[PDB]
Design a protein around this ligand. Sequence first.
Ligand SMILES: *[C@@H]1O[C@H](CO)[C@@H](O[C@@H]2O[C@H](CO)[C@@H](O)[C@H](O)[C@H]2NC(C)=O)[C@H](O)[C@H]1NC(C)=O
Ligand SMILES: *[C@@H]1O[C@H](CO)[C@@H](O[C@@H]2O[C@H](CO)[C@@H](O)[C@H](O)[C@H]2NC(C)=O)[C@H](O)[C@H]1NC(C)=O
Ligand SMILES: *[C@@H]1O[C@H](CO)[C@@H](O[C@@H]2O[C@H](CO)[C@@H](O)[C@H](O)[C@H]2NC(C)=O)[C@H](O)[C@H]1NC(C)=O
Ligand SMILES: *[C@@H]1O[C@H](CO)[C@@H](O[C@@H]2O[C@H](CO)[C@@H](O)[C@H](O)[C@H]2NC(C)=O)[C@H](O)[C@H]1NC(C)=O
Ligand SMILES: *[C@@H]1O[C@H](CO)[C@@H](O[C@@H]2O[C@H](CO)[C@@H](O)[C@H](O)[C@H]2NC(C)=O)[C@H](O)[C@H]1NC(C)=O
Ligand SMILES: *[C@@H]1O[C@H](CO)[C@@H](O[C@@H]2O[C@H](CO)[C@@H](O)[C@H](O)[C@H]2NC(C)=O)[C@H](O)[C@H]1NC(C)=O
Ligand SMILES: *[C@@H]1O[C@H](CO)[C@@H](O[C@@H]2O[C@H](CO)[C@@H](O)[C@H](O)[C@H]2NC(C)=O)[C@H](O)[C@H]1NC(C)=O
Ligand SMILES: *[C@@H]1O[C@H](CO)[C@@H](O[C@@H]2O[C@H](CO)[C@@H](O)[C@H](O)[C@H]2NC(C)=O)[C@H](O)[C@H]1NC(C)=O
Ligand SMILES: *[C@@H]1O[C@H](CO)[C@@H](O[C@@H]2O[C@H](CO)[C@@H](O)[C@H](O)[C@H]2NC(C)=O)[C@H](O)[C@H]1NC(C)=O
Ligand SMILES: *[C@@H]1O[C@H](CO)[C@@H](O[C@@H]2O[C@H](CO)[C@@H](O)[C@H](O)[C@H]2NC(C)=O)[C@H](O)[C@H]1NC(C)=O
Ligand SMILES: *[C@@H]1O[C@H](CO)[C@@H](O)[C@H](O)[C@H]1NC(C)=O
Ligand SMILES: *[C@@H]1O[C@H](CO)[C@@H](O)[C@H](O)[C@H]1NC(C)=O
Ligand SMILES: *[C@@H]1O[C@H](CO)[C@@H](O)[C@H](O)[C@H]1NC(C)=O
Ligand SMILES: *[C@@H]1O[C@H](CO)[C@@H](O)[C@H](O)[C@H]1NC(C)=O
Ligand SMILES: *[C@@H]1O[C@H](CO)[C@@H](O)[C@H](O)[C@H]1NC(C)=O
Ligand SMILES: *[C@@H]1O[C@H](CO)[C@@H](O)[C@H](O)[C@H]1NC(C)=O
Lengths: 124, 124, 124, 435, 435, 435
Amino acid sequence: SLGFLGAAGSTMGAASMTLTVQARNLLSTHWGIKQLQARVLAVEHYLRDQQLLGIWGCSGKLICCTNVPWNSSWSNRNLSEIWDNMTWLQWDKEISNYTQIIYGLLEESQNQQEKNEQDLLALD
Amino acid sequence: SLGFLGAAGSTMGAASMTLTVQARNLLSTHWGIKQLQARVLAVEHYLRDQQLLGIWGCSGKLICCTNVPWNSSWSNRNLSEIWDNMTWLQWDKEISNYTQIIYGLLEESQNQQEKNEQDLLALD
Amino acid sequence: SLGFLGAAGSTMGAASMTLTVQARNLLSTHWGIKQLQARVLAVEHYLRDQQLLGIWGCSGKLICCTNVPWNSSWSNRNLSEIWDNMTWLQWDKEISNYTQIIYGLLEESQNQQEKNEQDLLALD
Amino acid sequence: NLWVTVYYGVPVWKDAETTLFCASDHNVWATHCCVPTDPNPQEIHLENVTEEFNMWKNNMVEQMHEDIISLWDQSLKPCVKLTPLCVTLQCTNVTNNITDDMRGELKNCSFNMTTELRDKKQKVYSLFYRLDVVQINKEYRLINCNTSAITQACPKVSFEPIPIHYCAPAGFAILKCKDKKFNGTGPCPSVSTVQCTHGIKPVVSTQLLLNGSLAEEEVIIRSENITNNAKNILVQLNTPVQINCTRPNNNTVKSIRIGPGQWFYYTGDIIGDIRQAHCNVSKATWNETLGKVVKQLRKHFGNNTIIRFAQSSGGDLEVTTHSFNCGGEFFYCNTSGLFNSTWISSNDSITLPCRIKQIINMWQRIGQAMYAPPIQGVIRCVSNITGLILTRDGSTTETFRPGGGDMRDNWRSELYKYKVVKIEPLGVAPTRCKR
Amino acid sequence: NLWVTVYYGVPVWKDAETTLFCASDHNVWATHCCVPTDPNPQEIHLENVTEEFNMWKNNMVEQMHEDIISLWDQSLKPCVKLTPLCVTLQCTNVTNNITDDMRGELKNCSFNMTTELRDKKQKVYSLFYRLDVVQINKEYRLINCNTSAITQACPKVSFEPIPIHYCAPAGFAILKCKDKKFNGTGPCPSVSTVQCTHGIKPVVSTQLLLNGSLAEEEVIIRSENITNNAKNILVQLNTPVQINCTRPNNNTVKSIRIGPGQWFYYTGDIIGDIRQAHCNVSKATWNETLGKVVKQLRKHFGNNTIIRFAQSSGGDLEVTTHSFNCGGEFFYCNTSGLFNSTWISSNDSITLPCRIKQIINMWQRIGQAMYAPPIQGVIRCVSNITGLILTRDGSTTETFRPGGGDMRDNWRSELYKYKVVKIEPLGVAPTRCKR
Amino acid sequence: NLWVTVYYGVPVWKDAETTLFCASDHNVWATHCCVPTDPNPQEIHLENVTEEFNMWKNNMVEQMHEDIISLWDQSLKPCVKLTPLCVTLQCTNVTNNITDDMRGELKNCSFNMTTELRDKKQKVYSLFYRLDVVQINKEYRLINCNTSAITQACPKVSFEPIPIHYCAPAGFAILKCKDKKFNGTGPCPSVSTVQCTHGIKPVVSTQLLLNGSLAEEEVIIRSENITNNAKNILVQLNTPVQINCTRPNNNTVKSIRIGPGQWFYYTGDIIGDIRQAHCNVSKATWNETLGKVVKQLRKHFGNNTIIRFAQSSGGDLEVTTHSFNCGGEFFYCNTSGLFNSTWISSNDSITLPCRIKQIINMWQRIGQAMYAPPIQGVIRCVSNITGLILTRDGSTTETFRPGGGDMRDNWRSELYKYKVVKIEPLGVAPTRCKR
Ligand SMILES: *[C@@H]1O[C@H](CO)[C@@H](O[C@@H]2O[C@H](CO)[C@@H](O)[C@H](O)[C@H]2NC(C)=O)[C@H](O)[C@H]1NC(C)=O
Ligand SMILES: *[C@@H]1O[C@H](CO)[C@@H](O[C@@H]2O[C@H](CO)[C@@H](O)[C@H](O)[C@H]2NC(C)=O)[C@H](O)[C@H]1NC(C)=O
Ligand SMILES: *[C@@H]1O[C@H](CO)[C@@H](O[C@@H]2O[C@H](CO)[C@@H](O)[C@H](O)[C@H]2NC(C)=O)[C@H](O)[C@H]1NC(C)=O
Ligand SMILES: *[C@@H]1O[C@H](CO)[C@@H](O[C@@H]2O[C@H](CO)[C@@H](O)[C@H](O)[C@H]2NC(C)=O)[C@H](O)[C@H]1NC(C)=O
Ligand SMILES: *[C@@H]1O[C@H](CO)[C@@H](O[C@@H]2O[C@H](CO)[C@@H](O)[C@H](O)[C@H]2NC(C)=O)[C@H](O)[C@H]1NC(C)=O
Ligand SMILES: *[C@@H]1O[C@H](CO)[C@@H](O[C@@H]2O[C@H](CO)[C@@H](O)[C@H](O)[C@H]2NC(C)=O)[C@H](O)[C@H]1NC(C)=O
Ligand SMILES: *[C@@H]1O[C@H](CO)[C@@H](O[C@@H]2O[C@H](CO)[C@@H](O)[C@H](O)[C@H]2NC(C)=O)[C@H](O)[C@H]1NC(C)=O
Ligand SMILES: *[C@@H]1O[C@H](CO)[C@@H](O[C@@H]2O[C@H](CO)[C@@H](O)[C@H](O)[C@H]2NC(C)=O)[C@H](O)[C@H]1NC(C)=O
Ligand SMILES: *[C@@H]1O[C@H](CO)[C@@H](O[C@@H]2O[C@H](CO)[C@@H](O)[C@H](O)[C@H]2NC(C)=O)[C@H](O)[C@H]1NC(C)=O
Ligand SMILES: *[C@@H]1O[C@H](CO)[C@@H](O[C@@H]2O[C@H](CO)[C@@H](O)[C@H](O)[C@H]2NC(C)=O)[C@H](O)[C@H]1NC(C)=O
Ligand SMILES: *[C@@H]1O[C@H](CO)[C@@H](O)[C@H](O)[C@H]1NC(C)=O
Ligand SMILES: *[C@@H]1O[C@H](CO)[C@@H](O)[C@H](O)[C@H]1NC(C)=O
Ligand SMILES: *[C@@H]1O[C@H](CO)[C@@H](O)[C@H](O)[C@H]1NC(C)=O
Ligand SMILES: *[C@@H]1O[C@H](CO)[C@@H](O)[C@H](O)[C@H]1NC(C)=O
Ligand SMILES: *[C@@H]1O[C@H](CO)[C@@H](O)[C@H](O)[C@H]1NC(C)=O
Ligand SMILES: *[C@@H]1O[C@H](CO)[C@@H](O)[C@H](O)[C@H]1NC(C)=O
């Protein structure tokens, strides 16, 4: 089963097999203004993450690999450790300091890719 | 050329040729609140359909083919009966008891498909 | 560099280099109603543009090359005369009179493309 | 062999309950709160679509009811509270130039009221109808003193119904039944889809429906369960009956200040003599109207069944008389003269006497009351009777009486042909197409 | 060698503050206005996840506090205002048929009230508790006349707490601490994810906590910083202590109309022998309970330290005595009999000499008073003591007292197990996939 | 042989009207209502962008006006109403220590006021400034008694303007005009984009604008139509003119209780000589300022003409006289000393006498009033004149008079550099790329 956050605590390698279950759990007087605000926020957060996936060229996919190389300065660990001995909570603590850098690189990479596709098509 | 729900009553294979005509109409003192809640609700329904298409790998397509086989236990008719005699309203009623099953299968299929592509791009 | 609309006024060619700069700034008591009413608009406008791109066959690539030919009756400037000697504001003022025509053509060609893909995959 | 193909934009809907909004284009219904109506609304015919409609199980009716109550109450929010008016009132009869039928109808009353300054009092007098005062055990009080505070309606605001168009939110649609003779509950073979309803006028009346829609060809009799005497029968008409109503008295209106920013309006006196309020219908037209009604009732109750009409009885004026707003004034007319006949197989008018009331308790609620300011001069209006509310009493003779109460039925009649459904654009079907 | 891969739907979260909503399950908590709950569909146990919880830094607690107050005020919004009662009262003692335990507790007062007609007055008699009546210089006024407006609570709206479940907004999740012997601030080795908290009954009390949850293994002491005598100590019990509270007198309630549509309810008379309100706690269980509390305090203070329980300090009745709403009336009880012992290295019961007050100024807000209508009949409540609020005295002996009054702490008692986190579905990781 | 290519994120826009929200940066503007401003807003210069601005069609002004009225009214919602004060007053003149500047401008009134107990009364003595008191036939009433009730402003809430920043919602942006010497209606060659405006203080005044922005280099004269004699002229200044205003009287504030939970504040007495309120400007500075105004007016009306400044035309004090809020006090000052000069092609002050009024009818509305509580002690404030509002009377000497009273003219004097545009990120263009 393991609904919602049930995979938390498992290694990253195992946790990647449950991405779908947490995707479908996103996006769900004076008192109503509290419920209405909550509904709006859920939508805004959902859309901002989708916007990034669109910008980076991932869009509707759950898993996307890109052309941005991994820098050892962000983290220098063996794949056999990160994907079998650290959890997605632990990893976040370790990589957090570099995620703004990474996101900027993902955006630039996609922009370069789009220009290249437009030119190749023009060249037929 | 009809408009909106005007295709209802036509055969399934006829109605299916005009999907954009309806897609365009999605998203198109509490009198303030009633109007605001209605706008929020319209967005929420829109987004749930789009998320679901995204999970299945059908984002942005209108017509999307999959790898999940059709079961005779859900329905068993000749394709000519389904596409040439029946309409969509009749069909939806006939298979209303299998939509949860089908959706679960589509979600499983796409998740496995994404994993297989991730491995191929790493050259196995 | 030149955040948000800073490239406005530059020629169309140069301006197209920063499309993500503007795209990323989209969406981003009685009184509390003015924020809810503002947030909902930001979302509806965002979604309507995204829906239109989706219908046209552009899931969101920023730059989508379509299969609809350009008509000289809309504009007969040569390409340098458009891309090197004009900005986007000027361009939009000139093309505005024909944008409903163009949009209709884009939706129509996409429906034809969708049908063709579905049939080829029945033969595949 | 076959695979599941996903389609989006599919012409499928399911019955649904959602919130509708108004679109319409100094007003009780605060129509400025609505969006404007689109000058070119669309309607599309849905050939080969047969849908089941049920006017007796329809949430559009309930929302119209709720919106009308709220709009009505909201228009009294900024108006004067006549709490200084609930005093011992000293009254005598108006005996000056009285028609026999108004002997002791109208009364003359004296008050000690408040003024602009709190230390002062102003002695005033006014004329009241008997219906709004109750004896103290010459000492009278207003009828609302032992149930509610009364709010004076603001004089600039009109009570004339303005058509309100109801519109569905995106993702929803309103289906409409165009089937002639549709009785509101069966399958409807001919439908269309609209985004907005026609404008519906929130006309308020009992027994006889005014200014509604007419049937194209014949009288249609609609009921939830025709054999259940606890249910009302709504009879539409295919012809209007013209009714001419009046308040044939030239009233002079006076006003006083009762406190800072507040004033009270009342009838000061009447110029000339007086006459009883009344309504006229043509006798011949009324006889044809009933003949059509009787034929349709016989189809339901038996060819040789005798159909009899009778006056209603029991309850307050709202369920025994024909109440309505005319000229902004509130009328209570006696329809006994219309419903007194038994049916087996040149300027002659029918005159219905009417009373006038100023303290109005609407929507059958308690704890709220409105004071309807008097209107200067003489009042006349002409309206069309477009349907009846009848109830069946309970072998040989079936007796029908005028019914009333529960405003939902007036709205139910105009909305009988509309249904709300939700669009479900996503679905699947088997095809030969894979991956 | 390695490239960045983006994953969406990643099982991570961050601490966050968001707005929670009511899901609930004639009440002052507007329980009909909440989306209803489901039948506790699930909780997800999270294996190998240890989170840090901090009950002293918790926005769920602050939101509950604010929502309870808002609901409270809304429930009085449509109720009768009692402004006309602020008059000079003429009062004499009620010493007729008393036991002399109550001598001076009740007074028989008379006054001139407004009525339906504003030009009339009606002299009435009623009984008042001494706590609500203050001598002006025989001439008395209500205690609230010089500080606040007073509104009568609606007689048809109940103060019986209904469990309210609090649910996460979409995009958020509530983590619950399952571990036993969790003291509120450290890591919690075993947690689970829920969408809604259990329903919490918003019981209002001081000194002792009533109708909360029980600890299962041991009495648990929780405080933010136990070495700081400025902090309160919350003690959670393993067994309930059953407490019976009554008002032995049979009261007759009368109702007077004080203006159009409004009436005031007041004690008319008392049928019988006037006796003191009181509440019973069995000694065997209370003495056992204190011993258990002391053992846990000794773990923190030393075996060789003497622990003394003492009664409260002087101050406002609301904070020096136990307080609760029983049968609709507000009781204040002297708990000294429960905290009078020194601990060193039969149905015999404790009786608490309780008193009743009708004028209420809750949440310590000045300017907002409520009148508690009298209850017809005799009042009996049985409730469970599920915890204590203790304060620490500022060498060899420590003293603890029944302090309290800040409602936020009552909520901390049940909300200590929950934390709200934001779900953060995106993240990146290195891998061998390129494109 | 080109194809349509779709671009998203295109830097274009259209004129649009949307809802703006406030962002701030014990106050009547309720700045806690606004979203706190980020300490580092960005401004993005747009090279090669020329846009048309039209300050007279700028709906940002209308929104600011509505927000100001709304905030103003909300701040009075919970304050004490003074209905009990609209009683006959007995008044004599205060002649006891008059310098003849104030002879006839101050009266000593007494009246019968309510108390917490509704059956008691108190005799109150208070001082009024004549403008607030009108004769009935020594019998006076407050001027508001025959229009509306008056609400006392809450004494703890300041009226001092706080800069309010306005912010556009996502999808919209505000373009700002950077050109110097921009008159508000033509093209602006140098612009920048901002998300939020600078903070604008909602300073409320007539005739002379206080504490606004200054012109960059020279006086700028702006008008909707310079030849339309029905339009106002907004003259900005490139230099401030200092103005020193005072109420040089030591006021002792007294208060009484008027009902449960409520109190009224009034001036009790004045210590020392009673003197007229006044404002000072430098004569030389003022004369230099007009010379600059005159040169710029000549550019529009001819350099061979005569410009004459004259007094306001008469009518209501709120229009004909300069007004401002100083210390929370409301001043009305005579500007005839400033606009009395004909211009033909050492520590000398100008003193403007002022009047004080406590009953304020703001925003030119009828039916609302505010009572301004007295201020303890002596009031002094120093402010900058940053622009004038002039009108022009219809080969001749032109006459200019003070104008204003329409608050949109004050806002529009700050919101002239900003316009709101909708971002339209989606569009198409031809290229060689096809698919
Ligand atoms: C929590 O940690 C334990 C190890 O202490 C995990 O247990 C192992 O799970 C794998 C399956 O992935 C089995 O093949 C091993 O045999 C188990 N080890 C032992 C000692 O039994 C457990 O799965 C972890 N919990 C989660 C949610 O991942
Ligand atoms: C309603 O049903 C009729 C059939 O009963 C549809 O008419 C047929 O349309 C096909 C395709 O164009 C023709 O080949 C047939 O000859 C037509 N039959 C008849 C009897 O006319 C009609 O189009 C349907 N309505 C809608 C809106 O789809
Ligand atoms: C504003 O316009 C000027 C031209 O008047 C642009 O400057 C030119 O840029 C091109 C491309 O780099 C050069 O080849 C020219 O030599 C430049 N001309 C001059 C006179 O410097 C300028 O870039 C434009 N601004 C923006 C934001 O696009
Ligand atoms: C006003 O006229 C009514 C008649 O319409 C008088 O009321 C009648 O009084 C007699 C006793 O004298 C009763 O027997 C009748 O039953 C009463 N009729 C009604 C309808 O109430 C009334 O007394 C007159 N009042 C004044 C002040 O003249
Ligand atoms: C309205 O017309 C429908 C027929 O369309 C009548 O419905 C039938 O009622 C009988 C008796 O209850 C049922 O046994 C049938 O099954 C119903 N038929 C259908 C198609 O629903 C209905 O009674 C009529 N109502 C009125 C007031 O005339
Ligand atoms: C009403 O009750 C009060 C007590 O609440 C009586 O006053 C007390 O009288 C005794 C002497 O017998 C004094 O020692 C107390 O100090 C008094 N207490 C207070 C609070 O005043 C009072 O005499 C009783 N009056 C009547 C008429 O019975
Ligand atoms: C509740 O238990 C925690 C342990 O989880 C105690 O916290 C430790 O207290 C010591 C006291 O010096 C600190 O130095 C540690 O940093 C604290 N943290 C942990 C995780 O050990 C806490 O004091 C206990 N609460 C009470 C009231 O005793
Ligand atoms: C509070 O009241 C309850 C009953 O309402 C008491 O519990 C009961 O005690 C009697 C003996 O006196 C037993 O016969 C009952 O069986 C007990 N309760 C039940 C029904 O289980 C309780 O003792 C009282 N508490 C105190 C301390 O007075
Ligand atoms: C209060 O002062 C006013 C003037 O400010 C007095 O009224 C004036 O009296 C003089 C004669 O001394 C007349 O010439 C003026 O025309 C009067 N002015 C007005 C407006 O009538 C007034 O009499 C004084 N009242 C009291 C009680 O002292
Ligand atoms: C403000 O400045 C603009 C120019 O920036 C003036 O606009 C001109 O007005 C005349 C008379 O209507 C027109 O014939 C010109 O074509 C306008 N020029 C432009 C560039 O628009 C405007 O009149 C000035 N306003 C005032 C009050 O003087
Ligand atoms: C790796 O990161 C460092 C900064 O931590 C930077 O100087 C270096 O250029 C980066 N290298 C690559 C290949 O991105
Ligand atoms: C008005 O008050 C007087 C007493 O001053 C009383 O005699 C008279 O009857 C009252 N009149 C009315 C209509 O209440
Ligand atoms: C009304 O009555 C008066 C006597 O009070 C009489 O002179 C007048 O003519 C009457 N008016 C009518 C229209 O009968
Ligand atoms: C029975 O009813 C029919 C109409 O349905 C009518 O034509 C016929 O004359 C009637 N027969 C009688 C009189 O019973
Ligand atoms: C009621 O009013 C009368 C007026 O004569 C007064 O004498 C009496 O004392 C009042 N009684 C009370 C209890 O206020
Ligand atoms: C107060 O009321 C008394 C009558 O009770 C009256 O004589 C006196 O003049 C009033 N006082 C004032 C200032 O009007």
